[PDB]
Amino acid sequence: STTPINFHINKPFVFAIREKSTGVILFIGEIGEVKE
């Protein structure tokens, strides 16, 4: 119903993979260049 927010990842970003019950960060990093 609500108008969507644009979240366009077209530039460097930081990201993390976490688990909620422990709160632990399993992985974390920064992407400055996209590779395949």
Add this chain to the structure above:
Amino acid sequence: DNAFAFDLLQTTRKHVTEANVFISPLSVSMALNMTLNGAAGVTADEMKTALRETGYTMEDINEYSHSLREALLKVDPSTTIGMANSIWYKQGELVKEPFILANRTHYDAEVKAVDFSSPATLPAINGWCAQKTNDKITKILDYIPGNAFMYLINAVYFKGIWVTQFKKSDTKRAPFRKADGTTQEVNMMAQKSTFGYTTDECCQYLEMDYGNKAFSMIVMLPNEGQTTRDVIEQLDNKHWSMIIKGIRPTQVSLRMPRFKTECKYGLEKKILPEMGMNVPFTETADFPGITDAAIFISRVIHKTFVQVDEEGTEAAAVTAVEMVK
């Protein structure tokens, strides 16, 4: 308490020059905590300092590590999680049983006495890494030095499927502005869904769940003119808590690149010394819990892999602590 994760990220980012950084603080702390069970005196104190574990006993660190591994392995059967540990030591050397038994008990360590001169030993170790990472990290070592004594190796593996997957038919070629200012063409995935979202003065934040929502990815996207270096330098438990508690379900039109990155670090060179671990990398190190022989840490090798795509994310890390005479 994710202070070690943020301090390791900040210190790694300061000492490496590559555009991408990708680490598993969980893997590094598990391999170093196995090693810490054998350290005495200042060797142990400096390792606790670098791990942000000062003020905790080994009993509490080991019990926490064990309970954490147990929780992560069973919280979501719809996500694949691996947490494996192994110890490889020089055949004919005496390694103390209390140290082996502590690491078998709290880290489920697989302990092997090996001939480091055998042509079979490097492929046995590297094959173990491949087995514990779905063949995403196939080698942790290229060589074994002649004075090798022991390897303590952790492998973390993750394969999650997005709660709301992208359709590959919606992926389009689009520009991505690199950190060095040049633009490249990428495969830009797209979907419109309900996601966790929040903002602050610097950035936009998104939370993308996997499986039964126990695990998720947090994305921090700096606003125009803002930088990831500033995000990294400002991250700490307080800022992380502000992000997590601020997340609200929001309708979002997401554009995300399909991306992969593989990183390799020698954490002994600059990163762990800056975090406070100095004596363990020298001949003055003391590991009487492991052996009567004078040993020290020569390398802390950390390798990682991540692939994000329309289905989800596959990530792996291996950390090997190399001890030598």
